């Protein structure tokens, strides 16, 4: 499982960007689907961004969780709904209106996936 | 009126009757949790029986289950393959977990043909991980009642706990 | 020996075992009703397992269920969506209602392929409307035991009823 | 991950939860039998869920069930069609027999498509003939407690047995 | 809809990186498929990059538009062809030969997609 | 073909980040599936990252190769196994235990893919 | 639901023809399938009638319940068996032998059924 | 089998309305499909009736035979053609032109049909 | 086509029972499906009737149009909706609340239907 | 998003564009009729495109079409098989009748698979019987303009009517 | 009443309505041709709607189309890929050609399942080659009206032809 | 020669004939746009009829449509659900939009079986959004001709615009 969290620059978080990833890894491990050391997360801040066509100042947050395939839609819907409740409780605000938080769960292919331990 | 719709409503009506039977053996805190789960299964049955034309549960409800699961996962120290039903009270909640796994397989057939109830099947999956953790708490506070009875110097009050399934 | 025949006999054998478990929590009047229902499910199992070569229940038996339903429908004053299992005794009969709805869906598959058991499926449909009314009576005479205990001036005997699920 | 595999594992997990609920009403001898059956259903679930890549139960276990069945068949004097649930304790074991007949029909679908679990389905068939004999023993030693209470000259201790379902 | 535009460092654009995203959001809104405030764009510049095995100095531009599923192939082909005409009119040049501009349209899954407004 | 290599900050490579991409482009061209100038690679280093829930210091490496669809599973398994042997021979180490190297091969859609040369 | 009850002229009922319809409407409403004001019943007596070819004096009773379609065979068998027990407990006798009571349940089509309230 | 014969008021029959039903019950019993005492017939005369839009005085006759299902189309076509020859030989005339005689054979459902003998 | 109109006794019509059938035959002929002389209508008043279980005085009106089979659901829905607008404009009122008017369109079988002209 | 739904919406959008083209050749009375038909096809398209989740036309609208048909059926004296398009204005309305027969065959496929739009298909069937009667009125008042021009003693104004298709 | 029969009759009724609209823009010679085509499409609709039980068109009618095609093929000097609708009058006949190609594909489905209407589909194939030649004649006599207006020395009467689409 | 190929070529030949009919009612600017669309539909018909063996339209052509759509979207101020065919000239272009939606559904069947014509179906989707915007411009410059006629003090020249469908 790879979790890429992409926040804008004007987004004010209640915690550090490092303590947000510790809460997101505990909420992924508590689903009982992944191993402990196989949950890998990263946080990316964006410098140049636009939302919409209007001139109002906005901010957003987006996570893309990539898991290996072979899990039913009840497991993938629970993983997106467990992560979206973690990110939404970390946003203090940004911009001139509400922050949009969204989480995508996508499936990597299991047959062509290579993995090694150096 | 379709065939996977009446099977999914029949098992969700079966699950909320087993929870109503098992909420009389638990204490006053867990009875308030199980009575709010029974209201949420009633909201799922209205959504599935109308094929999505009535609104179902919100995502606020799944955020309430997972905030309970993260609370009880700290008390439950995980162990090996333990048999279901240590005490009589935790044996009733291990039955309701296996109805919620059967109700999840019926709702997953409604999702794979009609495209509805994907947020409902994510509730029954988080429910059966709470009923597993709720059953393992009752075995613990029954077992922590044994260590206080060993230190109290009781002869009859320690063995009535062991006759109810308290772990040694 | 066919596949819908062994499923319909397996659920009707499952339903008459849940009734035999739930007839120990009811009073002496409702135990005589539930012991005569158990004989009629045994007559349905002989009819379905032999594909109609043995005679089943008569239409006299369905006229006995509906004359009980018209008696208990006057005492049960209908209300809003109430949760199953108000008391412990009425929680056991809300489980047997949902097995009778599952047994009805199995007998309806035998009817739609073999053309037998249409009078049997009309018994299980009138049965699950009686087990709903039988469960709502026990919650009422438990609750009418609360109003007499409020007028009797009792301190301990009123709260043991509320610990068993008597409505306020 | 296949569809008959998750149904067969779901009913075998449902059967071992009903046995864990029903082993608190039996005496100390039958509790040791039912706790060893719960370990053997856990070995079947590992074999079916892995499609035969993990070893299951041995033929030593089916030789242990049938040596118990030949012991209890001498005490149970067979009679006519008796209703399930004479006593409350023997009513809980008549429910677990009908889950084991449902779990047998799921394992028989795994055998007829994947060719695995033929020694597992022979365990659940010998299990449901033991749970029928285990239920008929408890009704007898409850009834032989009635004849000793008739000869002891008891007024209150004879009728509390008849209120629990002792046969006359 | 999320639009991630990844340009190299040697690529010279005719405009600012911010004014490229305003033209790409107006060309996504003019297709009539998305709402106004749901079009979220971001621009990423790359420091370390290689194209090909030859030693000639090259540059490229790449956009990946992620939309929710449920749209036919005529809608997704029009969205990639409307965006590729916006990016190609913003490239002044870079490297020693032609700039390669490409646009991928991929489909997020609608059932497992979570979304909130803080 | 787009190759995005994402390494953490504590990961020590045996070479430069630029010479890792020259070895990964020669191992993609040697499969005989892609053209010469169509192999585009980029290397991204991460500042904020977490692996697992434990407090031990770890590092990882991840590549995501996006190719166009229409190739069998024997070709995609060979592309992930040829790239995972290149990245694992470039890792000197990082953290307090072993480095996890993984390669995902995903398929872009061929009909909605736009491409131009400015 | 329309209930047409057709009795012969020599049939002696234990009640009035009006009190038979009040008992038949309470037994139709107690099935929980129909609304209260949508159960419409009517009683028709017959002047000219013949049963069989023999010269023995006979009498009969017949009800035809027409409901809208969309209900399973367990519901329609219960509606005919609940009505046949109401009519058979109202017959005192008629003719020189037993009275034959029968109830037909037929299904109206739901799509072509019009309904208004003046 | 239920036979409902509906004649208008201006229709002159060659016999009594009671002797028409004795001939129709002997022609139903002679088909060998029904029992003797299960053939139940009734005759209804109509006071208010209209046929067509023209002002010419007309009369008609109509029978509706309701049998239980499970019989092939050769049996139902013979039952309508055996009854239509009985009614047409009993009509003396009525109105100012020819009398229209028609017979419908409809099928009751066998599973939901209740029957008792008081 | 046979049209049986069944009104209760307390129902007050704006016209005669005979002039209601002339308006219903012109609305059946104007659909262009039936011949002129084949549209046969009859009006039946009811003496004993009950609607619902409550003690409020009600009235209703019901028509059952029986046509031969072989027509699509658009033709049968138009025939019920053209007749329900004729009957509802003829009801003055009756009882203590609104009158319920309903029209059923049922299909006779074409193969077993006999017809003669005396 | 289904395949018979997008075909039925595509032909109903095609029919309301042909009516908007043909309402410029008719007089001020028939333009008000054709502009109210265009609103009702827009209500049908919202009902079919949402698979019945949005309410469609009422039965009041079909009672408005049939009360117009019974008005124009008295003026149109029926004749033999006359060719479509006597005048240019009545040739445009004979095209819209044949789109409404094509739109009826698409809505009838939605009804035979999804069970929706039976009141919508009864509108398009009554519509194409009005567009046939609306076309035959315009040929008549063009032809009754010929008999008044014969009695007025006109040389040029009678033949410009015959060049537009007035019947002799 | 079958499904390919009502589609083939619906498109042939659509084709004869487009011909009745397009016969008001042509001269007095081509109006007599298009009014005799409208009678022949009415004979095809009676043959297809009755599944061959009524006689259709004769082979004398196809010998009348091909003797017209061989007459107009001499005047139409063939050229490159010219766009449809040079003038407004020849744009109406390029629409009726594409309905006759759609009506031919519906009649060809009736032939490939019921074996009827092979002489009808040979009429619609020779029809759409005449409507192509009829459209190319009207563009020519509009263009030969331009060369006479250039030699007549007209200033306004030459450009009103070019505003109607006369070729230069 | 395949069945979805001849249907997709038949509707694209039907669409380019409706455009050639509707380009005589528009001004000199929009006629040059509609004559270049007719050349591009001819390039699509060569690509689809040869199953991709002939090259079709380039991506330069779809970049020409969308640069026209972004020009006309500024003039068209969007409003509520307006009926098709405000004026007679904008009623002809609302017909060609609904043929382009029908031609898009035929080309989408060629793409979903033969894998060709995905760049062709993206042209017909951008075309039907231009024909919607082209129809709404003609209603506006007809309506802006009404406000100048109100200020000019005209009695007859203002009402001939309202007889052609100018909005008030």
Residue numbers in the entry:
A (entry chain X), E (entry chain O), F (entry chain N), G (entry chain P), H (entry chain G), I (entry chain F): 2 to 119
B (entry chain I), C (entry chain A), D (entry chain Q), J (entry chain J), K (entry chain K), L (entry chain L): 23 to 190
Q: Which text from the study accompanies this structure?
A:
Our scaffolding system uses a DARPin (Designed Ankyrin Repeat Protein) as an adaptor component that is genetically fused by a continuous alpha helical connection to a central core comprised of a designed symmetric protein cage with cubic symmetry (12 orientations in symmetry T). With these ideas put together, our scaffold presents multiple symmetrically disposed copies of an adaptor protein whose sequence can be mutated to bind diverse cargo proteins for imaging.
An initial 3D image reconstruction was performed using the cryoSPARC program, focusing on the symmetric core of the scaffold with enforced T symmetry. This map exhibited an overall resolution of 2.9 Å with good amino acid side chain features all around. Refining the structure of the scaffold core against this map showed that the core structure is largely undisturbed relative to our previous cryo-EM model, with an overall RMSD of 0.90 Å between the two. The 2D class averages showed strong density for the symmetric core of the scaffold. When a highly symmetric scaffold is employed, as it is here, the frequently-encountered problem of preferred particle orientation diminishes. Scaffold approaches should also ultimately provide advantages in streamlined cryo-EM data processing, as a large symmetric core greatly simplifies the critical problem of establishing accurate particle orientations.
